[PDB]
Amino acid sequence: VDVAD
Amino acid sequence: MQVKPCTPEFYQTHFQLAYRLQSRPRGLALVLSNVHFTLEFRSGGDVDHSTLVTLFKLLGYDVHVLCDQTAQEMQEKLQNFAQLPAHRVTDSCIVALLSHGVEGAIYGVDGKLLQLQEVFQLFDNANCPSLQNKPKMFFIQACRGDETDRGVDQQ
Amino acid sequence: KMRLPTRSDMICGYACLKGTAAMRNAKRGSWYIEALAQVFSERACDMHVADMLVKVNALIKDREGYAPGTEFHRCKEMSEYCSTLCRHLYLFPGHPP
């Protein structure tokens, strides 16, 4: 899944 | 990964209107990745790091690497890197920084910030005379705020 | 004699825009680095760096978040670059052979 940097 | 070479003809027809870029190595490259913090673990940051080290090597750069540095360590080591003697005889420089960040700054592993203005200044015409008139590339993989972009419908 | 501004001949690629978050996948890494490496490996032979960063912008504009059940599902990102370059920046990879 995509997450925030 | 493979980097297609340019042709001799391409070089001949483009070199006069481009920065001089024929030194071997083309430049030094620094890849600095922070993955473990206090600021969640940066899952996938290992893939990013490996990818860039491989890329910059294939582009003909001598690659230096740093991992999980405090803000103070980043500042000191970026300065050491900018002051290296190799810069006089290379034609360009690459610095890639990968971490958490905020607008205009990036985090060390201690949750302290390093200002990007401070980073760029280390490589400028006053502080880094060996890189005067030479192209200096910076790639910054870091958030610049906490606003998630929800996206908008195309009309 | 010709003198220099204090700062010049820099190009800075940013993964996201001012105020916003950049996206990263557990398995594939950050969207921006993934795109950057794909474009530079394919096009460094015949495209200058600012123009490659434009191709990266195209890739990022088109991607969307996959994270069902959280604020990131279908989310977006936009990369940018800023330049004080004064010439074309070609990397001339593998020349001379």
B49 touches chain A (CB under 8 A): no
Q: Please calculate the CA angle B12-C42-B1 and round it to the nearest 5 degrees.
A: 120
Experimental method: X-ray
Residue B73 in 3-state DSSP?
A: helix
Question: Which one, of B124, B9, B28, lies nearest residue C92 by Cα?
Answer: B9
First to last CA, chain A: 13
Question: Which one, of B84, B85, B95, B92, lies nearest residue B60 by Cα?
Answer: B92
Nearest CA in chain B to C50: B137
C82 touches chain B (CB under 8 A): no
Contact B135, B19 (CB under 8 A): yes
DSSP for C36-89?
Answer: HHHHHHHHTTTS-HHHHHHHHHHHHHH-----TTSTTTT-B---EEEE---SB-
Domains for chain C: give ranges and CATH numbers: 1-97 (3.30.70.1470)
Look up the CATH number of the domain holding residue B42. Answer: 3.40.50.1460
Cα–Cα distance, C69 to C67 (Å, whole number): 6
- State the virtual CA torsion across C88, C82, C31, B139 in degrees, nearest 10: 80
In degrees and rounded to multiples of 5, residue B99 shows phi and psi of: -170, -175
Nearest-Cα distance to chain C for B48, in Å, is: 5
Containing structural domain, residue B30 = 1-155
> Count of domains in chain B?
1
* Segment holding A2, helix H or strand E: strand A2-4
Question: Which one, of C8, C10, C89, lies nearest residue C50 by Cα?
Answer: C89
Sequence-distant (≥ 6) Cβ neighbours of residue C13 within 8 angstroms? B137, B138, B139, B140, C32, C36, C53, C56, C79, C80, C81
Cα–Cα distance, C23 to C71 (Å, whole number): 12
What's the gap between Cα B132 and its chain centre? 18
Nearest-Cα distance to chain C for A3, in Å, is: 5
Active-site residue flag, B100: yes
Q: At what angle do helices C31-43 and C49-62 cross, to 10 degrees?
A: 140
Cα–Cα distance, B8 to C58 (Å, whole number): 29
Cβ neighbours of B40 in A, within 8 Å: 3
DSSP letter at C23 equals E
Question: Which one, of C33, C4, C64, lies nearest residue B124 by Cα?
Answer: C4
Active-site residue flag, B93: no
Q: Please calculate the CA angle B123-B124-B129 and round it to the nearest 5 degrees.
A: 90
Cα–Cα distance, B57 to B38 (Å, whole number): 32
Contact C11, B138 (CB under 8 A): yes
Within 13 Å, how many C-alpha atoms sit on residue B17's CB side? 4
Sequence-distant (≥ 6) Cβ neighbours of residue C62 within 8 angstroms? none
Query: In units of Å, what resolution does this entry have?
Result: 1.9
